[PDB]
Amino acid sequence: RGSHMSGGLRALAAGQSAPGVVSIGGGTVFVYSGRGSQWAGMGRQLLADEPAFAAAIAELEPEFVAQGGFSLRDVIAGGKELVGIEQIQLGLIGMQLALTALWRSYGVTPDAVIGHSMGEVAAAVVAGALTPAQGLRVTAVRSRLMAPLSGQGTMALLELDAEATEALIADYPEVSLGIYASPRQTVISGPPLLIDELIDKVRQQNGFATRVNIEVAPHNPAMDALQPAMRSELADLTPQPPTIPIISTTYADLGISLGSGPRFDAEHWATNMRNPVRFHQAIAHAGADHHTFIEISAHPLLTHSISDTLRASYDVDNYLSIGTLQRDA
Ligand code: NA
Ligand code: NA
Ligand code: NA
Ligand code: NA
């Protein structure tokens, strides 16, 4: 039935498509979003009808119980709301890894991964730079550090390019450019009263602007306060070089410069939560030679931005930008 599956996944789930199928060009990129997008009953039918999904949830559950005092298995089965930044972030990465297992069971695996904002932890796990246990650990530490800030920040998506956004916020020292979303959209981050003021200005100047469903201000100066504790608590984190190309959204150079490769260690995660998200540039880089982009999320929020980026550089008739699950049935 898969009422909440994307077309590509549902077709594989029923067996209508052949293994790994999803004309398009070659290459597949898995995109891990940074936003929690829980919807009522998320994963409930998956847990009962998709053994690969259920195995992943089962395998994560012991670490969650002991690393998070929270049961993802019970959230999914009981359709419980994730409450608080810690449950939201921890639940999201569990869903991301379990959904990656689901695609794998139907022959769909990534040739490269992209992590958007906090979704770069999940990307690093799937690329082999971190183990699932290490991914939970990073998520647990960071989310606990951000939880006390709940309600002191937010973000907003604006129908402005990056330089127009920097112009808008020039006189707003507390507001930052948070995400380079596409050539046409940019996310700002900062104190909620000021984000609301900027949303209104964009609308009154005949543009489009929306609040992000988030109650902190990542990718902003506010995060400086948290970086020392990040480096201390994750001091013992020992990552490995990735085995799948990972295009990092943390750095201007996408973490793919000649020479040494990024080390996905405590400093990287402290940097990832503070630096602006180079999502536009990572997608552009990836679309040079990869033609299928799959957002690994509970509800597709990046597929339009992906398509906008790809359309600016490539012939999108040869491309496919899809999600995994969606809140509508
Ligand atoms: Na399965
Ligand atoms: Na897997
Ligand atoms: Na592990
Ligand atoms: Na290691």
> How many domains, in total, are found in the chain?
2
Residue 179's H or E segment, with its range, is strand 176-180
What is the pairing mode between strands 176-180 and 186-190?
antiparallel
Q: Which residues have their alpha-adjacent CB atom under 5 A from ion ligand 1? A: 50-52, 105
309, 200: one domain: no
Residue the block writes with tokens 């796990």: 125
Do 144 and 163 lie in one domain? The reply is no
* Resolution given for this structure, in angstroms: 1.9
Instruction: Assess if residue 48 is contained within a domain.
Output: yes
CATH number for position 176:
3.30.70.250
Whose atoms come closest to the Cα of 97: which ligand? 2
Tokens of 190: 């900062």
Report the CATH number at residue 229: 3.40.366.10
User: Which-ligand-closest: CA of 135?
Assistant: 3
Answer yes or no: is 203 within a domain.
yes
Secondary structure (DSSP) of 28-54: EEEEE-SS----TTTTHHHHHH-HHHH
Residue 241 placed within a domain: no
Residue 265, CB half-sphere, CA atoms under 13 Å: how many?
11
**Do 303 and 198 reside in the same domain of the chain?**
no
Q: Are residues 71 and 207 in the same domain?
A: no
Backbone φ and ψ for 247, nearest 5 degrees, come out as -90, 105
68 and 115, same domain (yes or no): yes
Q: How far is the CA of 57 from the centre of ligand 1 (A)?
A: 12
Tokens at residue 269, please? Answer: 């995660």
* Å from CA of 74 to ligand 1 middle: 19
Same domain, 315 and 169: no
Amino acid at 13: A
Query: Where does residue 210 rank: exposed (0-12), middle (13-18), buried (19+ CB within 10 A)?
Result: middle
Are 115 and 228 in the same domain? yes
CB 142 within 8 A of CB 118: yes
Paired tokens of 284: 């552009």
Residue 41 lies in a domain: yes
What is the Cα–Cα distance from 106 to 100, expressed in whole angstroms?
A: 10
Nearest to 247 by CA among 96, 115, 109: 115
Active site residues: 117
Co-location of 115 and 202 in the same domain: no
Ligand that lies nearest to the alpha carbon of residue 137, given by its number in the listed order: 3
For residue 20, is it within any domain? no
Ligand 3 mean position, distance from CA 33 (Å): 21
Same domain, 88 and 145: yes
Q: Is the dihedral of CA 127, 131, 133, 134 positive or negative?
A: negative
Domain extent, residue 123, equals 30-149+219-235+246-322
Q: Tell how far the Cα of 292 is from the centroid of ligand 2, in angstroms.
A: 18
Give the torsion through C-alpha atoms of 164, 170, 173, 176, to 10 deg: 10
The verdict on residue 10 lying in a domain is no
Q: How far apart are CA 100 and CA 56, in angstroms?
A: 9
The closest of 138, 140, 132 to 57, measured between CA atoms, is: 132
2 in any annotated domain: no
Cα-based angle 5, 32, 48 (whole degrees, multiple of 5) = 35
Residues 254, 142 share a domain = yes
3-state secondary structure of 178: strand
Are both 41 and 131 inside the same structural domain? yes
Tell me, yes or no, whether 16 lies in a domain. no
Task: Check whether residue 191 and residue 132 sit in a common domain.
Answer: no
One-letter amino acid of 160: L
Q: Tell me the one-letter amino acid at 52.
A: A
Q: Which residue type, as a one-letter code, is found at position 175?
A: V
The Cα–Cα gap between 271 and 174 comes to 18
